[PDB]
Ligand binder design. Structure first.
Ligand SMILES: N[C@@H](CCCC[NH3+])C(=O)O
Ligand SMILES: N[C@@H](CCCC[NH3+])C(=O)O
Ligand code: NA
Ligand code: NA
Ligand code: NA
Ligand code: NA
Ligand code: NA
Ligand code: NA
Ligand code: NA
Ligand code: NA
Ligand code: NA
Ligand code: NA
Lengths: 292, 293
């Protein structure tokens, strides 16, 4: 259930910056039809930083409601204060979400022991499966394999979204955890490599606009058909890269709009609209992918 | 002028349950008044801004302002990674008595230079208070470049920057793009004296929590061009400048304050955790090197 192509879904907005349900419905219908394994709601790509606690909870519950049992929903529950993370987590207990994605605290740079006590306290206040999430380029801290191994012994700590793009982390973690600990890439451009080394899937921004390809690529990787997966990956590589040509989710929201998947590409400050150059680049990447 | 010299990034002292401890904060503020500290930054990074909710944050700022009682200026930490949050935090301290705001680049969501421009511009437009930008890429994932600083210096109440890269070339890259009354403050204790000798006007300092008079003298000596004497102080303090980050700030400086008798307990809020045995030994030796123990 926590394997294959998982979309880190955008939070579509109207021109005032409020959540646009009609657009989110369209995306969720698109992912059900495309074979996406699951939806991560209000991750980084979903602009977690700029939704307040109640808007955040509302978007997750909206996503769950619209999913209507057709596709599993994983809630973004990360926070850089352990009390905030527990409170967010408790908000979704017994909601119908199948698990949580909880990022290492950002900006206050805790120690490895700080991360251990942080994630352990979170896990002790829920029954939901917990997927750790490491992305040092955003957070200023690096959850190391040693610490992941300590945390994997905690009951409902069940996997990790590893977004460093450092592919040596795959088997560094795998040798410290049990066979059913889930290893998920959080870096689209290196995700097929990550799977070929033993990863079980990807929590993906590219899947927002290339869901069918991403789902088939990940299934082929799972079946060991890496040559066939790489043909898809190469079609998608310009998107993997150029969806970060400006701060995510600025490009992917523009791309969703360009494809008719959402009504507007509006974001909340401090995100700002895509530049002329960025549109040109993302459009070429979408054309390279065969989507335009 | 008011934003020069030694400015303490003051800890938020807590009791054993993690609640703000007014009695320890009062002692610290009296200590800074007697030590000649130029100003207090309230609820910055060293003050555990992340783990105080909006009401606790505002309460700590108002407490610090009340305890200072006009004896020393107070600068409120008002940064946020959502612009709406930053405006709302800023609006809370309008006409409170604080003299200015310290506002960090959005963290975790990694905005562009244009996003930083619009962020800080929108903030400045919702306040009459002086704004001090704060760049610390090692924490935020985001680097406010001098060109963008120069753009923002043209917004009238954006009046300075706390530059915490430790990259000393930024001093004059910024200074040549701004007017001469734009304030340049180090946010990196180990390189602060270097920063001032290159033209910086002061430092927003963690070391000043426990070596306030030394830090006040070092900055005043630097300001008067007495760099040889300032360097003597800096070498007394350099192990502290470094070892107060031997573990995540403010874990070492809070333990040092407790060991010096300045606060009652060294308690923090998760995901900060208590100082290790090795860390205590390292920080004690640095305190002894400064002559403080
Ligand atoms: N802007 C803050 C608050 C988040 C509120 C819940 N989405 C942060 O990024 O941590
Ligand atoms: N923990 C969140 C919310 C802070 C609330 C105000 N001190 C952050 O660091 O941005
Ligand atoms: Na709607
Ligand atoms: Na660490
Ligand atoms: Na540690
Ligand atoms: Na390790
Ligand atoms: Na487990
Ligand atoms: Na008290
Ligand atoms: Na402000
Ligand atoms: Na100005
Ligand atoms: Na400096
Ligand atoms: Na401690």
């Amino acid at each position: 259930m926590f394997t294959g192509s998982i979309v880190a879904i955008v939070t579509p907005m109207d021109e005032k910056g409020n959540v646009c349900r009609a657009s989110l419905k369209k995306l969720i219908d698109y992912h059900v039809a495309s074979g996406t394994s699951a939806i991560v709601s209000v991750g980084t790509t979903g602009e977690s930083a700029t939704l307040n606690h109640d808007e955040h909870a509302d978007v997750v519950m909206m996503t769950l409601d619209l999913a209507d049992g057709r596709i599993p929903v994983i809630a973004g529950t990360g926070a850089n204060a352990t009390a905030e993370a527990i409170s967010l987590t408790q908000r979704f207990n017994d909601s119908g979400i199948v698990g949580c994605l909880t990022v290492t605290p950002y900006y206050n740079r805790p120690s490895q022991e700080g991360l251990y006590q942080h994630f352990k306290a979170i896990a002790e206040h829920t029954d939901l499966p917990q997927i750790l999430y490491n992305v040092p380029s955003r957070t200023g801290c690096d959850l190391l394999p040693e610490t992941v191994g300590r945390l994997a012994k905690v009951k409902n700590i069940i996997g990790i979204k590893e977004a460093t793009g450092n592919l040596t982390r795959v088997n560094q973690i795998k040798e410290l955890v049990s066979d059913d600990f889930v290893l998920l890439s959080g870096d689209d451009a290196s995700a097929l490599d990550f799977m070929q080394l033993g990863g079980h899937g990807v929590i993906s921004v590219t899947a927002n606009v290339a869901a069918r390809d991403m789902a088939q690529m990940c299934k082929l990787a799972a079946e060991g058909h890496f040559a066939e997966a790489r043909v898809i990956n190469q079609r998608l590589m310009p998107l993997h890269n150029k969806l970060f040509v400006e701060p995510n989710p600025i490009p992917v929201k523009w791309a969703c709009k360009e494809l008719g998947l959402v009504a507007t590409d509006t974001l909340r400050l401090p995100m700002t609209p895509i530049t002329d150059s960025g549109r040109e680049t993302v459009r070429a990447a979408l054309k390279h992918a065969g989507l335009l």
